[PDB]
Amino acid sequence: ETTALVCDNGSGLCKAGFAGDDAPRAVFPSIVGRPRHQGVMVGMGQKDSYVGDEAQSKRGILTLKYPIEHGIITNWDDMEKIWHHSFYNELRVAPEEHPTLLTEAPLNPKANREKMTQIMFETFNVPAMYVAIQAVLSLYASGRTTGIVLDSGDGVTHNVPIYEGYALPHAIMRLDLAGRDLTDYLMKILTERGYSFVTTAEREIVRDIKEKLCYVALDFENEMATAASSSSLEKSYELPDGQVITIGNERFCCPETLFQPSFIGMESAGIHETTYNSIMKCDIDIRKDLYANNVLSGGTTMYPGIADRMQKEITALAPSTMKIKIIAPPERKYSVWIGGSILASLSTFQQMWISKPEYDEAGPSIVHRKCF
Amino acid sequence: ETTALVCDNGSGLCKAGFAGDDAPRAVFPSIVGRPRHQGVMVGMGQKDSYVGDEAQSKRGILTLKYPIEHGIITNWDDMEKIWHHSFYNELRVAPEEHPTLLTEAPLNPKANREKMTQIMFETFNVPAMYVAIQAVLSLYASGRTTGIVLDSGDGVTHNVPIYEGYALPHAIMRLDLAGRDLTDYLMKILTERGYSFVTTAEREIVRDIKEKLCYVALDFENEMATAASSSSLEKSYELPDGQVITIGNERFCCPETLFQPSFIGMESAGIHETTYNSIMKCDIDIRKDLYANNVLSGGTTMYPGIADRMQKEITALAPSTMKIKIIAPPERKYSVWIGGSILASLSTFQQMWISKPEYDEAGPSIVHRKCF
Amino acid sequence: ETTALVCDNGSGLCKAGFAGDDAPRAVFPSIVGRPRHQGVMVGMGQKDSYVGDEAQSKRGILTLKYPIEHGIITNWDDMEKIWHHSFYNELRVAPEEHPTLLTEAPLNPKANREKMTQIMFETFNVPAMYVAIQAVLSLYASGRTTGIVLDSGDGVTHNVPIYEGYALPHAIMRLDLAGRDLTDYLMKILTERGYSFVTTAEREIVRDIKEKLCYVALDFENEMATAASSSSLEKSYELPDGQVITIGNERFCCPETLFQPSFIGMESAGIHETTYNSIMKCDIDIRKDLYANNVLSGGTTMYPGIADRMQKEITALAPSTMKIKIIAPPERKYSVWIGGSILASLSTFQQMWISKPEYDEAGPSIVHRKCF
Amino acid sequence: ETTALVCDNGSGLCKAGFAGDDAPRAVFPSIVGRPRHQGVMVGMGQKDSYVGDEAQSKRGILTLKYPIEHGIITNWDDMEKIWHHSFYNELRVAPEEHPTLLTEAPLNPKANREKMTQIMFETFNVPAMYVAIQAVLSLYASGRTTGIVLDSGDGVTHNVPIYEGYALPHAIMRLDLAGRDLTDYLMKILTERGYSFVTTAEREIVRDIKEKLCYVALDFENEMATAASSSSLEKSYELPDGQVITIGNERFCCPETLFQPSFIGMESAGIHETTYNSIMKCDIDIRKDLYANNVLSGGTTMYPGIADRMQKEITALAPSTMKIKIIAPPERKYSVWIGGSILASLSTFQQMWISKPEYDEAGPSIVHRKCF
Amino acid sequence: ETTALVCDNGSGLCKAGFAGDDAPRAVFPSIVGRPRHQGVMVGMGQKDSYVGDEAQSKRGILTLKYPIEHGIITNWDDMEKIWHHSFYNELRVAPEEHPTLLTEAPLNPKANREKMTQIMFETFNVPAMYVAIQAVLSLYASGRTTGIVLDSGDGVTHNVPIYEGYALPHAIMRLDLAGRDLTDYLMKILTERGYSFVTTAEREIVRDIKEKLCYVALDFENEMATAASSSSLEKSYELPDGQVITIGNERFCCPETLFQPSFIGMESAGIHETTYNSIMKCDIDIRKDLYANNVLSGGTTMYPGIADRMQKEITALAPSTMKIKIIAPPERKYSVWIGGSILASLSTFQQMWISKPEYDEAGPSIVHRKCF
Ligand SMILES: Nc1ncnc2c1ncn2[C@@H]1O[C@H](COP(=O)(O)OP(=O)(O)O)[C@@H](O)[C@H]1O
Ligand SMILES: Nc1ncnc2c1ncn2[C@@H]1O[C@H](COP(=O)(O)OP(=O)(O)O)[C@@H](O)[C@H]1O
Ligand SMILES: Nc1ncnc2c1ncn2[C@@H]1O[C@H](COP(=O)(O)OP(=O)(O)O)[C@@H](O)[C@H]1O
Ligand SMILES: Nc1ncnc2c1ncn2[C@@H]1O[C@H](COP(=O)(O)OP(=O)(O)O)[C@@H](O)[C@H]1O
Ligand SMILES: Nc1ncnc2c1ncn2[C@@H]1O[C@H](COP(=O)(O)OP(=O)(O)O)[C@@H](O)[C@H]1O
Numbered sequence A, B, C, D, E: 001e002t003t004a005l006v007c008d009n010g011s012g013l014c015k016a017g018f019a020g021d022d023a024p025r026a027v028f029p030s031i032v033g034r035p036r037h038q039g040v041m042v043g044m045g046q047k048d049s050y051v052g053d054e055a056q057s058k059r060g061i062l063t064l065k066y067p068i069e070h071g072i073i074t075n076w077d078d079m080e081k082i083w084h085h086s087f088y089n090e091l092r093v094a095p096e097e098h099p100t101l102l103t104e105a106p107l108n109p110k111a112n113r114e115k116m117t118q119i120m121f122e123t124f125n126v127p128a129m130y131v132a133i134q135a136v137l138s139l140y141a142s143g144r145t146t147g148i149v150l151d152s153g154d155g156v157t158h159n160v161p162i163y164e165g166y167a168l169p170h171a172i173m174r175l176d177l178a179g180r181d182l183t184d185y186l187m188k189i190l191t192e193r194g195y196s197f198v199t200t201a202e203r204e205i206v207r208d209i210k211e212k213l214c215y216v217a218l219d220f221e222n223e224m225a226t227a228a229s230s231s232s233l234e235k236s237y238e239l240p241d242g243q244v245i246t247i248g249n250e251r252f253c254c255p256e257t258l259f260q261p262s263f264i265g266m267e268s269a270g271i272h273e274t275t276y277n278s279i280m281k282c283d284i285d286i287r288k289d290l291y292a293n294n295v296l297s298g299g300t301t302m303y304p305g306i307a308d309r310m311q312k313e314i315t316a317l318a319p320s321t322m323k324i325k326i327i328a329p330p331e332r333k334y335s336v337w338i339g340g341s342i343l344a345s346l347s348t349f350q351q352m353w354i355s356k357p358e359y360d361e362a363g364p365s366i367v368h369r370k371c372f
């Protein structure tokens, strides 16, 4: 009878809210900030740790740590702080009266999911819980039942093909290139113009620059020639202290790492080749149905040139008699949460919750037998 | 008073319909498909088994099984599924109000016919039923009363000679070489050009290739020399994913196994020698009447060179003073069903039905005393 | 008068040497490594491509490519580099004074053998050459004349039955599951414990882990229960940078894909069912003689549980009144080369060489008429 | 002075040996086996043709041909191979120092005997030779001088009456129904239980089944009722690959074709009616002497119910005042050879040999004037 | 034919000389001194700017400015003065007859290198010019071809890993903590004992104190407790005017900022953690070869405790099964110049010079395509 909770815990952003809603109620950056300097004023309240938007607002005197690195939770006390902020401070609910739906990247370690179940059942003891794959939730929110989902967030870029509600786990591809690596490459290539960003708050400044100014070029070499010829692609950004920086080719050399991973010294192929290799790893009779249903999800896929570029590259890779369609909804930054809210409100889902007596009987191993 | 049902249950295609019609109403492939992958999206309909055209439409995520192998039913639950799809889903009738005519290959095991009678009288309980030989039905649909019928389908190729309505059972020849063996041979010889087809859906793709592109050469050695000399016999086929394959001599090296079974390591003789041996096993005075009435039936005899080649080979085998005629009607793919509809509408056939009280009195053994 | 050369060119290892020897002189991995990073120091010799053990020794700065994939040569310049390293750098001989014996997998494309003939007669112009089937060479090295050979290497697992020196080509069954697929599956299941291997040098690291620590369980479910109960099956491996990884059930879940191909999403049956179906595809009177002479060959058949497991599975499949014997010699990793050395030293083989004038007269087609 | 040779050349077994012996030294099946598959292993001697027991031991890779079909030799090179195996390989003698006694069926073609004389005088040139009727040799081995011999072998069943050493050629009956037809009928009716035997080696397996398990029922309809009621007549046979088949009524349906030829679609009467018609075609005063001396010979008369059944059928046919006796010695499988050894050792037979000068003077026609 | 020039222009010292020499001919401080007071004595030679050792000798009446700050040139007229003093006053050569090799820190702005090329080709117009990375020159002077170079000078501390002459640019780390920051930290913490330094000449006095008296403690807490317990670590320095100062823990608290950057309010990690993170950012198989070849270079690495402390810290960070070696040659203060002299004297380097026609054709952008 009670309303479920959907808490998409990504590598860079936590999106929490209620099942059945259209948009997540709480979207906050998943950071924990701790003071690096010394406190000299007595009476003012300086907490030992700042979580979320409070860490971003006071980031000049804080060292910021991300508890999730490349989809895997590395700090567990910090993720306890993140979940405590998400439940009590933002959603303002008690977790013992609401089942909670959680998301997880494919090809993740089993200890991550087991400890997620253990913390969600013993610290904030929920009546029931479930772990879902983020790409299945993206396909749920897209409204279709077939397609290959390219989900690129802050730590993990993964391709999952699903045909008629059936997943093909041997064709699931995972690549550790996402928005944090693009941010770091922007820190590296911003020093070529003389702008130095070294601290963790400057990483957030560079991330804001990347979010507001970067774009994907349709042709990389023609854009390189155009940027070297004329200064028509240069844009100016105002720093928080007041300085104005100007960037030229770095607006499109930063997300080009998504298509040329060798820019950051990785042997892997681009996202278009990863998508094509995931399609040709499937059975032949479904491949056409995977060609016309390329679904984009995640915040890294929000550059304003990426759909046409992926369409052009996959059309160059696929045979010419096939129709290539890239499904890029405008709400695809939150599509994993929207699909989680769709799934948690279904009447056929209520018997697949992992309840507290099943966790008491089986221990933290029921999540490998009731979830994929 | 009620209309009878004719249900030709071949090894590869089930053709069902009403007595008195010209063409069968429901022609669907006799396969049962079961999901091999895992289902991850809930709410939409996932059945445990897909039967017929639905199994062909979703064959990329299914393992397809044929319930009938070489004319003998191996899976009986799958055969019940096939009959249930034929009666309720395709013909949309209740089997308890219609007598049913079924077909069977010659020299078949008795337990096959007994279990067919048992299921057709206890599961879909019909008022009456009958089992007929397919070659007699082919001769019924041809409009003649004498001739030798070469029926080649998906599992069984059989020659049956009938003179003036009198069958000669000692000259009936059965050879286990038909369209599935030709499909498997095409799958084997397609790997010489680098095309690999290993799954059960790829078997259906190769079967479509064989149906669309293969033909019987009039002279095998001259056609092999022509294919080795110039690329005028090469044809291109578009795969379901979009790739284009090209085949040369494999257009005629695949049905040549009908005339040279040693291509697939079989000691038996070709269909022309089987026909000649079945003719020469009969009485001498009828042999001339069997020479001018060679009736072709079944889907395997639909290659566009087989009548001239069969004519040439029998004319080489028979003495030169005899006229050799190959009767190849254009509707011979469905001629067994057409003859079943002709027989089931006859006024002299209505007293040869096996009724339900006779089955109750005699058990599943009346079919050996009322049917040939 | 001159000594012949035997060069087994498999998908993962090249084994070259002289005829009449007991062990191959040069066993090196068949890879070509090319530098991915940039060279900043001049003066030292930095070649454009590294072949063999030199590519393995410097693999941290190289992208490694296999020229042969699933028994089929895909890169021909790289294969020319492999053969040039085999002849001049390892064997240290001139190829124009020695005939060369080559091996090939069954059911291979004809263009592979034709281009092998063209390069072996026009680039390294040998006086004569021959292409042999690897399973025939394995039966030559076993010393027997009858038996079914399961040869599993790096790309191809094939069963070939030979009775009294007569092969049955219709019962030859080829399956594209071998040690590279097991290495990829070990990559996929090593991420469950948090170990990430993505690069091509990490493929060699995972392959060394598989070669050193994996084994075939006699009973998979009992070993699953034993590994889940106690940590007595866990083994530790030291990585090249000093980290120690620990693996438990992955020691026997990796070669279990040989018996359950559905672990990597393949519709095919296991190697035991492949062997049983190859035996039952033969004639009846030889089947008992194929039951007691199961010959194992190749490096993939070197797991220390595979003979007992294959014995148990085939004894479960075969009727109980036949004796099942699995012939697993300790030198079966090199048995194809040993059989090639036995064959090339035979006095009755010297008239079966494909000489250079026959190649000049017939062109790239004599290898289909003088070899099987 | 030299020892003569007796070589009974039946349609299914060649029995050769020396005159004056009690049992033939060499009994081997008269088949020629030729390899149907390809040879891949060079070094071992693979002969082009296998004759006799070597063809039976390696029959899984051979096509087997019988040189004699229905008493008449069709392949003469194969009979040269059979005689060369009989003289040099089995008897281990040279034919040029031994006269040879040969047997032939009654009512045979004259060119068969002429070519037998031509081959026995020009290829294996003997000092002398003779052709005798097999039934006269059976009467010689029985020790009597009067009686009617029913000789049924592998191709020909013939009744010959002889009274006081005087043959009656007008009452000699030849019927083309023997053990090969019974083997073919058993091969046909074994498919009713689902056992398929189509190759030539499977014909030998079915012949072994017929030899080991078949019997003649005293009453056919009572045995039908007994087999249909209870499974007390069912017997199990082990196939060479280990499968166990079970046969019921087919143990007595197969030799019932000897009494009801219409089971294989043949217009002729049974062996009992043939014997009665041969007796009634003779003079009346000898008929009683033919009633009490029915001599059985040949391997087809070795069923363990045939003497009582034949006695019952003739006693039903003959008048009740005549005594009916069926002489069935236990050595009647070899009785033709035993009678040939008795005849060739006689002192009064040495003047009836056809010598080489008589053959040179008269040409291939002396055998029609010196033999019956 | 003419001798090239090697001019290492560091942030605090300019080392110029000829190629092929073992030691640089001219080592002078890169400062420009301008008179802050007024001139009253006419006739005395008073220049407007003093460069090099003349600025150091008269620093009591001069304000000293460094043209290079943190590896980036800020004053270009002063840089021209430094180069003019380096060529005409110290080396006493004409730059138009000698090619010049220059050094630059990694991750530097492109405009710095472009203006370096422009001044090098238009003000002191050289026949040819090259710009090289200083860590590659340190590895050149070490005599090895693999290793990770930690170069710490006056403005920039950078780690560059090189394996077999191949650099890994994604693992190159740059940290803006060097000897000028340590001089400022000692300048700050010398006020705790009552010694006040505020001016630019007093900065040179503090730099001399740091060069002569500071050292790196192996254990910081134990040395702090030892200095607090007994005054055995105190040392006395004589000021230029005559006063004697005494320092205690400041001998090891000043270079401890190299290992604890938070002493100067910097969020970055120490040089040992920077070295470890640069090693683990490389590929796995080279990491061992980077562990045993830690090459120290630059004047900041000349403290007499830094090799053992770096060895201890990296051994604490690395896994315990590996050998850690710190290569600290005694000539590592000038190792960049020695490597530049080695590189410029190589015969394989003479085609990598950027000549004057290439600069005239391409403009000041050829230095990004011919240099790294
Ligand atoms: N407008 C934008 N353009 C490009 N990148 C964006 C934009 N908005 C967000 N991002 C990137 O998306 C990443 C997070 O996306 P999302 O998947 O929603 O969060 P998470 O990865 O934590 O689940 C951030 O690292 C950010 O850099
Ligand atoms: N046009 C065609 N050319 C060649 N083969 C065909 C053609 N149409 C059908 N076939 C073959 O006929 C086989 C089945 O024929 P049919 O006798 O109608 O069905 P069944 O054997 O099930 O009774 C199929 O295996 C198919 O490969
Ligand atoms: N001791 C071992 N245990 C298990 N697998 C092994 C072992 N040694 C080698 N292999 C596997 O054998 C494969 C190659 O074997 P082999 O057949 O000799 O080479 P190729 O396939 O090139 O002919 C490699 O992929 C390797 O993974
Ligand atoms: N014990 C037996 N029971 C039934 N049939 C037998 C038996 N022994 C031999 N036969 C049959 O007798 C036939 C040959 O008998 P025989 O006359 O000895 O040889 P041939 O006809 O060649 O002279 C064979 O086909 C065999 O099937
Ligand atoms: N013996 C020493 N002990 C400590 N620091 C030193 C020593 N010698 C030189 N330094 C420091 O090294 C810095 C410059 O070193 P170097 O790298 O040779 O010059 P640059 O940085 O200009 O290339 C100076 O700031 C100086 O303080």
Ligand SMILES: [Mg+2]
Pocket: A009, A010, A011, A134, A153, A154, A298, A336
């Ligand atoms: Mg996400």
Ligand SMILES: [Mg+2]
Pocket: B010, B011, B134, B153, B154, B298, B336
């Ligand atoms: Mg049919």
Ligand SMILES: [Mg+2]
Pocket: C009, C010, C011, C134, C153, C154, C298, C336
């Ligand atoms: Mg191999």
Ligand SMILES: [Mg+2]
Pocket: D009, D010, D011, D134, D153, D154, D298, D336
């Ligand atoms: Mg006989």
Ligand SMILES: [Mg+2]
Pocket: E009, E010, E011, E134, E153, E154, E298, E336
């Ligand atoms: Mg320096």
